[PDB]
Design a protein around this nucleic acid. Structure first.
Ligand SMILES: *O[P@](=O)(OC[C@H]1O[C@@H](n2ccc(=O)[nH]c2=O)[C@H](O)[C@@H]1O)OP(=O)(O)OP(=O)(O)O
Ligand SMILES: [Mg+2]
Ligand SMILES: [Mg+2]
Ligand SMILES: [Zn+2]
Ligand SMILES: [Zn+2]
Ligand SMILES: [Zn+2]
Lengths: 65, 263, 559, 141, 133, 196, 114, 84, 158, 159, 43
DNA sequence: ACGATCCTCTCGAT
RNA sequence: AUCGAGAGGA
């Protein structure tokens, strides 16, 4: 269910970095680790926020009505 | 000048690593906290939902909206709805944004904060603007729609503070260290052999002289000099969090002074 | 059983409980909502009308308010509906079912209630959020912990009823329990773990804090005591300030193993005029022990004074710890490199012993002890061999543990942990066991299909050599699992069987009481004891004293 | 192609089973002091080898990280609680009308996984969050 | 307004048994072989070592809430370096022509052995410990 | 609850400030008491943290699979390379004061579950409501606004406290309470009550 | 459902004044000032400054219960010195330093590039 | 079956249970607008009052101690010593 | 020699040791008659029963024997004088003290010992959960039921 | 075994002694055996100790026993408590179980027995043989919702 | 849900004990506490 | 013949 | 609301 707006822990807006993150993975062919750091996510409170997210919405959208 | 004195090292739109010296730890902290919790800000604190054919719940979406960072520089000239003499809200104490999104294409339409649309009269004050630091310029991903899904909202952003709610925090994260070498002996490190080889060495040590082997224990020294850094969500420029922080704390103090007086 | 001697009563409440360090031992935190429901029939009296009327005006949905107003005829004016609910002129003689307010006496209990201590009267303290809030040192009597336990509250309805709770069943009154003839409420977790640290000789505090700690103790005489040190810096010791908590007139001598009115190990204990002279403060001193600072302070200063002793000690120690911090991590379970070496081989020889016994036995050389099968004797040996092994590898580990090691650090306070825990977490876990025997041959002549038939070696029959740290091996796992289960099972049993016994005892004696001629008879009148406990002395008012005339050489008895 | 077989407890009686294939079929021709201690592959008899010991476990226990560094009963407790956990029990929870349903707002796959969670679809429908925890005596609350 | 005991001591041993800011000192007395001393000292604020010449003093003067500075320009039994206050508890008969005493400085302990102190040593709480150079 | 048989209810929430903090400015989402560890020997929990920390740092999925050669060392070795103390401790400052905490703390990320059964779903609390028609005794369950069971066991306690009056008031004035008329010759409730 | 509104953390309700000054009874020239809808931030800052004044014999503070946002500052000053004054001074000395820091920061912030 | 004020063997001292019932019963009367035989130093709670009516031996109540045979002994709250 | 008895005498003493500030340097004002006869007299005012007849007057003696032993061994002439330098005043106080306390340690008619005991045994019983004998719950059960088929019989001869 | 023993000089010393533990009982015949000290022979089979040495002894063991159960667990319980039990178990001259076969037969009013295992029946054999319940048991006054001879209800209060 | 679908019940000498032969077939840990402990198993 | 307390909830039926 | 079966909390 969608990328958390802001990190539970510290509050660093994070919801505006999901797509960026994904791209860095697929095309830039980077490892989750660096991809994160490049997105400015340097502390672990803010790294688990994205690294762990399970974008379930993409599966809820396949339900027609 | 007088006491308290700074020494910025780094600086940008978001961070401000700086040395705050010749102050009391009590203050270094009071300052730190206040930054985290009492500097005002504008944030959606009420969502009127008209249509939500989405996969997400109303309040689930409403929650996220609240979290979306909004401009807040001129917040000092926007009132607290609870103080505005209007019934509910107005353009003197709020900022109303509209969100309307329709799943048009069969290729998933995304809904960003860049889609909020200020409807109220800003009255020429820089206030309530979906803050965007994206590269592509799509501040925050609010929601996603399918074939023909609708989402029609109307939010009312109000003045608030980290205390009523964290969405109202402008600060994000604040680093804070003092006495990089434990000269002050304010801690007793945990070791397995050499507490010096097992425990890392903070960048901040470089900015201070070591302990000098045989020197006795400095039993009179207290905490001077603090190595902080304020990250900033952005509703406020970093410089401001520090200032407004200092300001607010200063006002808090003054109001007690003003208290005795009226007493 | 369920309708006559056990009924569902009105004016009862139940929720989750959680500890609250800023609540007095004898209070109980009642979540505003619950207080707004439970009520109490108070009659209108010139000594109250003002408050009563004021509440009736507050109505049933603002806390210090009320519900229902009872009149002469016996009518019930429902305060939440009633054209005349904003009217109502109270009349002396009427009744105002009011909300439960602060300081009301209430019977608070946790089930199962196999004690008196399971049901005690607490002073009400209405507070936000929705969990009953209770002082930690009220924990054990009810045998609660905060992993989810719920607790029941009952409200006295009669003026007498209240009195009966506040004079007989009050938490204060129950600190020194008659069953163990010692106290039944000590000092736990943080307060205990901390108080110890706060006490270490090495522990000193300065001005800013001292002044807070002192203030923190509510009964402070505001007289800052002179620092233990006045030299280059005026520093106070831990003992110094804690002693503020201890009232005056409390004395307490101790002497542990190496004590000596100079206790080089900061051992034993010596408290005079309510001033702690020497000895680290931990479980023996402040626990719920016999000699205890609590047993003494209850007997000497009074139940209430001692009731307070808790909060004070807590408020101070807690604060101090709130600022010293304390924690634990894997690190705390890691043993000196050369140690694990000495340990691993400590076991290595245990195995060789078992092996050397085994070969002996298989040669028929063994000499069977009397009454035991050469087979029985064999087993018993190995089991002994392996137990010792575990215990020494364990001891071996316990010595590394530096005084800074948090685990050891709690064990020393006596706030959690024991040799065993360390020994297993750090060195070898141990020999698993089901039905008092080492793991059996569920399979034909073997333990698992991973061993060869006939194999009594330790690994094969349940000896978990590894530590919880190093990690177990499949077989080890499975085995340790078997025992694990045996445990959980008799766990479920040892509960019912006991629950039953708890009753048969209760029914059997139920009606026995100490009559007015100091005799002890049951309903029939049939004397059971001519003097209760054979001395007609109440269990709570007793303590282990030494009869100085029995021991010592004949010469010393004379000298 | 006969590279595997289905054995029931009865036939199990007549077989010898090696745990790890590797670690149990090399010839004995220095050892990491932090690794647990294992005995030896003493058996010129092996007829089978375990697919993987972690398989002796089942659904519930399967989600426990390092349950082999945990006291026996605590593993059983956790297994009973993993069933009271919240999360998305099904991607179509919105289209199902049933007596009570509890769903987590922002489920997170655990930073600590099990090579057996891949089959239990855990990472896909996680039940629990990855909170930053501190074991420490604080307000005493 | 008094002084109760003066004497230079020679430190024979300094023991830090699992404490990092405290050491238990045992120094003998120069002059009268009869007198010996056992004391707990905060080696962090006042180091000590192998054979030091320590000057000791007891007294009971320079109980109302403690105050601090201001008098930094007033009284000053600061003719020493290290100073402590405490409460004495037991007076013991080491037997023979010797007698000892015990003081507790908030846990920091001291035992004094001699004899002419029967008079010069108090019998109550009051008791400061002064040490210099 | 964690994933290691360690459950616990919340006891209070603290806002970011009042919380102890990391020099980096990181603060905990949750704080558990060290005391719930020595005895439960639930070490994996500790380990998992060591691991989950390193993992989040290096964006690597932490492998806490059972029978593997994964050591607390190999991990601590990895976490140090990441500029952190090899065990999980991290100097922390007291939120109120800003000062340092004399005791470093085990700090890291750990997977925690949100169990069902939430206070508000349990808070029942009655003060004389509806009673059973058959026994004239309070009804069961809270969904019905019933009463709490003052069963056998609770009674014994009251008896033990010697609080006679209270008992009567519990087993009568609250719950069953009824007035019956009896024949002064054959103690049977066979007396026709014609009150008027 | 038994949770109090967040704003009760910084907004005085009815019959609540920012300060209450009761004379301590144990000591002389002692006063216990209770603060309303204020937490550690102020409490500790004022406690610390109040301890710079050499005519101050005592000064501590406590939030008796986290649930509620209020605290107590205790003050004892040298005969003839009114703690209320000892309080006044402190708040000022505090504001002044604060202003100062405000400036000096703003100065430096301007010499910065970025 | 009565017992003269003499030959009285029961405890001169008042039992806790006796005083808790005495305290309750007087506290109750006081709660019903009944005359107070003491001077209130400013007390309002019935019980708290009744406690003070006992502390000044001014509670006109007598305890009847039944023995186990049937007989008994009447003791007055004025006689009974209240240590506890 | 360590047995639970009412009135912790040791304490009362310590509570005189500093309530009257007793100096171990000057001599007491105690008469050997004072102590000896005093201790004796104290033993007359303990009481647990008050019948004036033989039978009961003899029970009363029994129920106090032990405590008294404690009492005598503690309040002995040397001791009083050499062990804790009491004074006619302190000592005289210590006595009046014990009496009262004793009287306070007596059970109150009403005390429901039946239950109080039942529970005092049931509780610590529900704390039991585990050198080859039948113990714990099972055994306790064996006992209470008064079984005849006990699993671990045994005879211990000397 | 370990046994403390007064030494000629006064102090208690440890004079270990040989003792035979048995895996089977027959008290009646072993005391008589020579060499053993029949003064001390013992058994955990209180029943047997009863039948052979009298009941006052049986009570002793009965306690000696219970005690060991509770103390083997490190736990302590004041004498009186267990005392009362044993005694209650020992006043009727025999060994009366805490089972129904023992104390519910007791001689008590019908209602008490009612609240334990054989209600129905107990009340019939009670009706058949017109039993008169004093109503002085706590368990019965609880059934009639009246005060009982408890702390608060032992003494009566009067004007 | 997975766990429910993989459950086992055993109605009614020692049956709740985890047993040797169980290795490989039934989960050594997963089982309810008290009541039906050891009786309800999980493959 | 009995078997632990108290608890909330879910399904189904003359 | 009675009634019977299982699931779960401590
Ligand atoms: O949390 P838990 O139940 O511990 C406490 C108790 O409630 C009582 N109880 C529990 C379960 C049960 O089947 N029957 C009961 O009567 C017992 O007094 C429990 O003690 O159980 P655990 O997790 O084992 O407790 P802990 O050791 O604290 O982790
Ligand atoms: Mg628990
Ligand atoms: Mg529990
Ligand atoms: Zn973050
Ligand atoms: Zn407005
Ligand atoms: Zn009739």
């Amino acid at each position: 269910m969608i990328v958390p707006v802001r990190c539970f822990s510290c509050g660093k807006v994070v919801g505006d970095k999901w797509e960026s993150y994904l791209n860095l993975l697929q095309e830039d062919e980077l490892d989750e680790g660096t991809a994160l750091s490049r997105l400015g996510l340097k502390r672990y409170c803010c790294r688990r926020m994205i690294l762990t997210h399970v974008d379930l919405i993409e599966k809820f959208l396949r339900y027609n009505p | 000048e007088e006491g308290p004195q700074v020494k910025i090292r780094e600086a940008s739109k978001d961070n401000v690593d700086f040395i705050l010296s010749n102050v009391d730890l009590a203050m270094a902290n009071s300052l730190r906290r206040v930054m985290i919790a009492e500097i005002p800000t504008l944030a959606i604190d009420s969502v009127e939902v008209e249509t939500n054919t989405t996969v997400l719940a109303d309040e689930f979406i409403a929650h996220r909206l609240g979290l979306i960072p909004l401009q807040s520089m001129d917040i000092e000239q926007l009132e607290y709805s609870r103080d505005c003499f209007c019934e509910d809200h107005c353009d003197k104490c709020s900022v109303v944004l509209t969100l309307q999104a329709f799943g048009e294409s069969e290729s998933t339409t995304n809904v960003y904060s860049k889609d909020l649309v200020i409807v109220s009269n800003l009255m020429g004050r820089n206030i309530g603007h979906p803050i965007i630091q994206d590269k592509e310029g799509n501040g925050v991903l609010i929601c996603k729609l399918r074939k023909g899904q609708e989402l029609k909202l109307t939010c009312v952003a109000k003045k608030g503070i980290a205390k009523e709610h964290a969405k109202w925090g402008p600060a994000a994260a604040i680093e804070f260290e003092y006495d990089p070498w434990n000269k002050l002996k304010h801690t007793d490190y945990w070791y397995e052999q050499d507490s010096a080889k097992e425990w890392p060495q903070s960048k901040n040590c470089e900015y201070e002289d070591p302990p000098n082997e045989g020197d006795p224990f400095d039993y009179k020294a207290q905490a001077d000099t603090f190595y902080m850094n304020v990250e900033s969500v952005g509703s406020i420029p970093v410089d401001q969090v520090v200032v407004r922080g200092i300001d607010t704390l200063q006002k808090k103090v003054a109001s007690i002074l003003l208290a005795l007086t009226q007493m | 059983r369920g309708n006559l001697m056990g009924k569902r009563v009105d004016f009862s409440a139940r929720t989750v409980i959680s500890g609250d360090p800023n609540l007095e031992l004898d209070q109980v935190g009642v979540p505003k909502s619950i207080a707004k429901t439970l009520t109490y029939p108070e009659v209108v009296t010139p000594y109250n009308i003002d408050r009563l009327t004021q509440l009736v005006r507050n109505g049933p949905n603002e806390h210090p308010g009320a519900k229902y107003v009872i009149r002469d005829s016996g009518d019930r004016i429902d305060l939440r509906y009633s054209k005349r609910a904003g009217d109502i002129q109270l009349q002396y003689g009427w009744k105002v079912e009011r909300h439960i307010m602060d300081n009301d006496p209430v019977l608070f209990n946790r089930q199962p209630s196999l004690h008196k201590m399971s049901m005690m009267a607490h002073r009400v303290k209405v507070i936000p959020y929705s969990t009953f809030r209770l002082n930690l040192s009220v924990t054990s009597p009810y045998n609660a912990d905060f992993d989810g336990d719920e607790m029941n509250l009952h409200v006295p309805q009669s003026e007498e009823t209240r009195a009966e709770l506040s004079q007989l069943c009050a938490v204060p009154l129950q600190i020194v329990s008659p069953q163990s003839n010692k106290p039944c409420m000590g000092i736990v977790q943080d307060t205990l773990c901390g108080i110890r640290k706060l006490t270490l000789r090495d522990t000193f505090i300065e001005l800013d804090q001292v002044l807070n700690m002192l203030y923190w103790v509510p009964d402070w005489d505001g007289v800052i005591p002179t620092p233990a040190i006045i030299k280059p810096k005026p520093l106070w010791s831990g003992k110094q300030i804690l002693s503020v908590a201890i009232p005056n007139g409390i004395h307490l001598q101790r002497f542990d193993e190496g004590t000596t009115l100079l206790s080089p190990k900061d051992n034993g204990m010596l408290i005079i005029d309510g001033q702690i002279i020497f000895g680290v403060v931990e479980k023996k001193t402040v626990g719920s022990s016999n000699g205890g600072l609590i047993h003494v302070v209850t007997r000497e200063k009074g139940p209430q004074v001692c009731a307070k002793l808790f909060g004070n000690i807590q408020k101070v120690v807690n604060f101090w710890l709130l600022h010293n911090g304390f924690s634990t991590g894997i690190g705390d379970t890691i043993a000196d490199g050369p140690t694990m070496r000495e340990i691993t081989e400590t076991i290595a020889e245990a195995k060789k012993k078992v092996l050397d016994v085994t070969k002996e036995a298989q040669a028929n050389l063994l000499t069977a002890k009397h009454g035991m099968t050469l087979r029985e004797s064999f087993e018993d040996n190995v089991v002994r061999f392996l137990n010792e092994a575990r215990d020494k590898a364990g001891r071996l580990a316990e010595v590394n543990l530096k005084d800074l090691n948090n685990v050891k650090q709690m064990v020393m306070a006596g706030s959690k942990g024991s040799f065993i825990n360390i020994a297993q977490m750090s060195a070898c876990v141990g020999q698993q066991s089901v039905e008092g025997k080492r793991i059996a041959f569920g399979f034909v002549d073997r333990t698992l299909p991973h061993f060869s038939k006939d194999d009594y070696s330790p690994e094969s029959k349940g000896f978990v050599e590894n530590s919880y740290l190093r990690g177990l091996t499949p077989q080890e796992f499975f085995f340790h699992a078997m025992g694990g289960r045996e445990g959980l099972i008799d766990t479920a049993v040892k509960t019912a069987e006991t629950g039953y016994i708890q009753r048969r005892l209760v029914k059997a004696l139920e009606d026995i009481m100490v009559h007015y001629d100091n005799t002890t008879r049951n309903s029939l009148g049939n004397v059971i004891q001519f003097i209760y406990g054979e001395d007609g002395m109440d269990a709570a008012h007793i303590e282990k004293q030494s009869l100085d005339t029995i021991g010592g050489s004949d010469a010393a008895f004379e000298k | 192609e006969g590279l595997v077989e289905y054995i029931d407890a009865e036939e199990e009686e007549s077989i010898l089973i090696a745990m790890q294939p590797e670690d149990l079929e090399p010839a004995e021709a220095d050892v990491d002091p932090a690794k647990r201690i294992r005995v030896s592959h003493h058996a010129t008899t092996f007829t089978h080898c375990e697919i993987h010991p972690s398989m002796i476990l089942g659904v519930a226990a399967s989600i426990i990280p390092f349950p082999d560094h945990n006291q026996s009963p605590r593993n059983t407790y956790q297994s009973a609680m993993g069933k009271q956990a919240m999360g998305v029990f099904l991607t179509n929870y919105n289209v199902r009308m049933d007596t009570m349903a509890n769903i987590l707002y922002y489920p997170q796959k655990p930073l600590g996984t099990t090579r057996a969670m891949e089959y239990l679809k855990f990472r896909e429908l996680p039940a629990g969050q990855n909170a930053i925890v501190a074991i420490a005596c604080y307000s005493g609350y | 307004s008094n002084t109760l005991f003066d004497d230079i001591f020679q430190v024979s041993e300094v023991d830090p048994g699992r404490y990092n800011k405290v050491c238990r000192i045992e120094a003998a007395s120069t002059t009268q072989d009869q007198c010996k001393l056992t004391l707990d000292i905060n080696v962090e604020l006042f180091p000590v070592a192998a054979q030091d010449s320590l000057t000791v003093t007891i007294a009971s003067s320079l109980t109302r809430s403690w105050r601090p500075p201001q008098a930094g320009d007033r009284s000053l039994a600061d003719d020493y370096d290290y100073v402590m206050y405490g409460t004495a508890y037991k007076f013991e008969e080491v037997s023979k022509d010797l007698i000892a005493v015990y003081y507790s400085f908030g846990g920091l302990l001291m035992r004094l052995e001699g004899n002419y102190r029967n008079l010069n040593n108090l019998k109550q709480e009051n008791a400061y410990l002064l040490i210099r150079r | 609850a964690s994933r290691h048989g360690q459950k616990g209810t919340i006891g209070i929430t603290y806002r970011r400030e009042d919380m102890p903090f990391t020099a980096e400015g990181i603060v905990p989402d949750l704080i558990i008491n060290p005391h719930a560890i020595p005895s439960r020997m639930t070490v994996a929990h500790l380990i998992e943290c060591l691991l989950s920390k390193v993992a989040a740092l290096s964006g690597n999925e932490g492998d806490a699979s059972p029978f593997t050669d994964i050591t607390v060392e190999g991990i601590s070795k990895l976490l140090r390379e990441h500029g952190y103390q090899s065990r999980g401790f991290e100097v922390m400052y007291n939120g109120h004061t800003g000062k340092k905490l004399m005791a470093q703390i085990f700090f890291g990320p750990t997977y925690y579950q949100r169990l069902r059964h939430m206070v508000d779903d349990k808070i029942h609390a009655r003060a004389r409501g509806p009673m059973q028609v058959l026994t004239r005794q309070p009804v069961e369950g809270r969904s019905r606004d019933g009463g709490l069971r003052f069963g056998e066991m609770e009674r014994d306690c009251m008896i033990a406290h010697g609080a006679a009056s209270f008992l009567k008031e519990r087993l009568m004035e609250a719950s069953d309470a009824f007035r019956v008329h009896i024949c002064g010759i054959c103690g049977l409730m066979t007396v026709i009550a014609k009150l008027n | 459902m038994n949770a109090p509104d967040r704003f009760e953390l910084f907004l005085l309700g009815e019959g609540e004044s920012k300060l209450k000054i009761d004379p301590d009874t144990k000591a002389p020239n002692a006063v216990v000032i209770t603060f309303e809808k204020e937490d550690h931030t102020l409490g500790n800052l004022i406690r610390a400054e109040l301890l710079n004044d050499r005519k101050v014999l005592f000064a501590a503070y406590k939030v008796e219960h986290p649930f509620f946002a209020r605290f107590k500052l205790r003050i004892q000053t040298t005969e003839g010195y009114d703690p209320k004054d000892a309080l006044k001074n402190a708040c000022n000395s505090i504001i002044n330093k604060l202003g100062a820091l405000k400036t000096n920061f703003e100065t430096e912030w301007n010499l910065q590039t970025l | 079956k009565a017992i003269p004020k003499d030959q009285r063997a029961t405890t001169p001292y008042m039992t806790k249970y006796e005083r808790a019932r005495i305290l309750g019963t007087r506290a109750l009367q006081i709660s019903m607008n009944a005359p107070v035989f003491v001077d209130l130093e400013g007390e309002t709670d019935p019980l708290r009052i009744a406690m003070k009516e006992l502390a000044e031996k001014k509670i006109p109540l007598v305890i009847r101690r039944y023995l186990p045979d049937g007989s008994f002994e009447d003791w007055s709250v004025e006689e009974l010593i209240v240590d506890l | 020699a360590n047995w639970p008895l009412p009135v912790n005498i040791r304490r009362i003493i310590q509570n005189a040791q500093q309530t009257f500030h007793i100096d171990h340097t000057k001599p007491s004002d105690l008469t050997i008659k004072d102590i000896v006869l005093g201790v004796k007299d104290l033993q007359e005012n303990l009481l647990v029963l008050r019948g004036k007849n033989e039978i009961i007057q003899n029970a009363q003696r029994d129920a106090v024997t032990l405590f008294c032993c404690l009492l005598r061994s503690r309040l002995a002439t040397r001791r009083v004088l050499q062990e804790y330098r009491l004074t006619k005043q302190a000592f005289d106080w210590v006595l009046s003290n014990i009496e009262a306390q004793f009287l306070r340690s007596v059970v109150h008619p009403g005390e429901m010992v039946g239950v109080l005991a039942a529970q005092s045994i049931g509780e610590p019983a529900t704390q039991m959960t585990l050198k080859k004998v039948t113990s714990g719950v099972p055994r306790l059960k064996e006992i209470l039921n008064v079984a005849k088929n006990m699993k671990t019989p045994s005879l211990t001869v000397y | 075994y370990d046994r403390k023993v007064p030494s000629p000089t006064g102090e208690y010393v440890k004079e270990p002694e040989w003792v035979l533990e048995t895996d089977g009982v027959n008290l009646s015949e072993v005391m008589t055996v020579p060499g053993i000290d029949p003064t001390r022979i013992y058994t955990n089979s209180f029943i047997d100790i009863m039948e052979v040495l009298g009941i006052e002894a049986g009570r002793a063991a009965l306690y000696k026993e219970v005690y060991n159960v509770i103390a083997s667990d490190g736990s302590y319980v004041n004498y009186r408590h267990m005392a009362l039990l044993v005694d209650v178990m020992t006043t009727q001259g025999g060994l009366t179980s805490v089972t129904r076969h023992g104390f519910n037969r007791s001689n008590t009013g019908a209602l008490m027995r009612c609240s334990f295992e054989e209600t129905v029946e107990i009340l019939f054999e009670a009706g058949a043989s017109a039993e008169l319940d004093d109503c002085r048991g706590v368990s019965e006054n609880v059934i009639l919702g009246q005060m009982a001879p408890i702390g608060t209800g032992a003494f009566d209060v009067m004007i | 849900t997975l766990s429910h679908l993989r459950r086992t019940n055993t109605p009614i000498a020692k049956p709740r004990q985890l047993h040797n032969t169980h290795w490989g077939l039934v989960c050594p840990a997963e089982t309810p506490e008290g009541q039906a402990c050891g009786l309800v198993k999980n493959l």
